[model samples]
Target chain A: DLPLDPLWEFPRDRLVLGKPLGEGCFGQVVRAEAFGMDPRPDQASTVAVKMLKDDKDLADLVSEMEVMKLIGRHKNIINLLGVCTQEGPLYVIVECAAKGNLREFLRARRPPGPPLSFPVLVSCAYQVARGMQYLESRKCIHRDLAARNVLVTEDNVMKIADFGLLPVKWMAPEALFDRVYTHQSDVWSFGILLWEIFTLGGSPYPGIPVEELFSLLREGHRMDRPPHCPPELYGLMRECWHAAPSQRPTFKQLVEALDKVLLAVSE
Target chain B: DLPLDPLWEFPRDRLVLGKPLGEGQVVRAEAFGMDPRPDQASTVAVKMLKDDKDLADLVSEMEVMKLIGRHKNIINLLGVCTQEGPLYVIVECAAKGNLREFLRARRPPGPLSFPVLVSCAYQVARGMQYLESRKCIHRDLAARNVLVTEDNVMKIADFGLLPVKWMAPEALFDRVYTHQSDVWSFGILLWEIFTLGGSPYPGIPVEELFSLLREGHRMDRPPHCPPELYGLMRECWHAAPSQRPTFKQLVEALDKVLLAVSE
Candidate 1:
């Protein structure tokens, strides 16, 4: 048995303010601030607190902690500040992504509203690709990659979060017989992130099933271009979803591609 | 932001269990508690955790939970515990027999496994025929889809109904009808059950699938059937795919065959 830690026992009078951010099956992400912070802390400094659901599964709890430990402390990755799981309600505290996730940002910028500037979306793609590249180097695959997992700071710096789902189906066909994770699958997911960033955070195959998705990919199918996607970025998305996982470009290659596209827009 | 309750805390001590109980994608039937006590005191209480892996389309973890919840009166479907990463291990505190496992145990000692393909196919056919006669189609038709209790009782559980477009060519042939297609799939499943759960169409390709069937393809070349049972399967697995037997015919035939074989 493991030693337990309480989620949050911060004194209320000393506590400044706390608010809920996002909700899911496991827990709720909250934004909160405490006294004696930076004299001139930017909005991005606002930290995140994941409140565990009343009924937490033991295996799942161990999984989240393991994944967090695996990728913690990198500058580009979300920083794990503290964890409290001793008491009834468990809480995980980390650096907050103030701009919220890509989904919220896109919803505000969607049609009838000022669309996200192409530069901003490109920047988002570059940041997400950077995180994926790091994970790829470590040989981890984020099977469920979506807009919600990509969080942008108030300073507009984007980083990946939620490492709960790891070791996905990315192994070679022969290796797949025994269920192993691989880097190529991460590349495939990176391609998905590219699509999400290009579309300012649209859902991937919104209503499709994984079985159908598998067959579709196996038989040479790719996502159609999203509305307003630039040619270079669109091409890169296509490259990521290349039928052969090896044929898909690397994260380093992706960064170069996005950097070039962003540079062109600046020019 | 909702209230950040202080009750949520991490375990201060290290949890050093041995390696994970089981390994593989998705959930495993072996991970659940095999025995239950009324006191419910152990750390291994099946109710303490939930299935962590819930990918879209693999299988519905929630439905599994609900089914277990409802069957708790008659069975012990473990409660949702916690989730880790790629694995969402759910625990069910009951001895449910997968059709594949059942066939393995029923195999006759010595040469072939117990229960001939035709006999098993017949039982399977009767199950589907019974379900359809009641105006329902067991969509996901496969040997593993059926469950048996420890007392040798069989029950078709898990409502995952997959349309059978590729199983038979001579059958109704449409992915959308009922009862008849169930019969064709029943034949395919019977082949699996009798063969000790060998994979179906182990090496068939997609592009040439339809053609192979139209040319009188049968799943006759396997470890599941003897000459007698293989003949019966041939009738059900006809290549035109559509000319396969109806569930009614399969039931009648299986009964007649079982009578002669059991004798």
Candidate 2:
């Protein structure tokens, strides 16, 4: 059972630390291992505690709280164990993976050191596709599904995290006078995620200014193909980036394609 | 032909009234009678101009302009009709019968007062219901619909005036007029007809008495209605205002009850 009260409220001596994990829009994440637990005493675990900054905009903080509350638990999803609310600052404690995010792992692993391995890329693709398939079943769309938001374990298990923009469908449009979200847009973002995993953590469009990128996206333009990316993965990325949002494939279809590629590589 | 230089520009001398029209809004209805020369001679008219005093804080005014420009019969939704200059208010002028003043004329017309109010109410309801079914809410629903044509047939006008809040669904929930909120305003409108053309606070003391209508709150008692029309107006002013009958209900109710012999 998740703790009812603040996990960080307990004295600092009770919690064991590994290192400063990373930082995100809402807070600073740090590696931790909780001690003195009632159940699972021998269960040595890794956790990421995100310390939220006080000066953060009320809207963003509220949005973060909403997303965290909604997508708190699932097998393939990262688990938010507890939150710390005390005098100094508020923090959210989440289960930490041993190998950090897919981006960081890829950056660290490749240097001409690990040749562009098709088998490893296909493995990552399969796991990421499984996570996406799970999310699709829940009717939840992860709007910002990129390499940075995917956490990987030492055993190469992938978990999707940072569900900040899930209920984007709730936002209405001026012209349509209805919600902006569509299943196709979710698939489009998933395709982008596929590109990220296959290319070993490349940014969606490296060196493009945000303003220009926004203009391009608004006018139905997508990023060009990444260098040295596999042909099948690149083709899937283009299909996902279709101008009309409805043309994109479902996560199930994506998984099927990934499975085919994996089956081919193994044989 | 429309002006090419600065798009549409209203002449300076035609400037008319400028005052607070309603909550957080003002109107600068100007008289642009000078521009229509001998060739296109028209009657003495007023250009009903509106601007958001704090434009930047809300949605862009151009969006509203584009919306109004869509419907042709809606008071000539003209653009800035002059060269590179500040856009000006221009319209095929209207002598204000402006439903408020028209209702005041019949306020104390002896036995005919109540009937007149109900008939006008029916017309307003018909126009509003037409707009509502299209998923549009007339944020400012009032006597203004009865803008007359010299022959005294009060025509429903300004059906093209676009309120930005009505454009976004979430905005309607936020602060802009939702369909239900518009019904609340329609209730006040019903009251306006009954009170016989008086300003909102004509008789009530400001401190001791309240405007009575609270935000999202409904009037328990219906507007003072003629015997035949009481039930429908009461339905419009239901206790839970949000649950109040929509304009469609008003239209159907009035169509069944309103009779030429009585009205």
For model 1, state the Cα shift of residue A241 in Å: 0.9
Q: Taking the tens digit of each residue's C-alpha lDDT, what string does model 1 give over A137-203?
A: 7666666556777777776667788755522222232233434445665666677777776766666
Clashes of each: 62, 12
TM-score to true structure, per model: 0.42, 0.41
In model 1, where do residues sit more than 4 Å from their true spots? A1-17, A36-45, A55-59, A85-89, A113-115, A164-180, A205-215, B1-263
Error of 2 at B108 (Å): 99
Model 1 lDDT tens row, B218-246: 65556535566566667766544357777
lDDT of 2 by residue, A100-167 (tens): 78888887777673333776776676667767777766667766666777887756667788765432
Please give the lDDT score at residue B215 for candidate 1.
Answer: 72
Each model's Cα RMSD = 30.6, 22.3
Query: At residue B191, what lDDT does model 1 achieve?
Result: 73
Q: What is the alpha-carbon lDDT of model 1 when measured against the actual structure?
A: 0.56
Assess the local accuracy of residue B158 in candidate 1 as a C-alpha lDDT between 0 and 100.
43
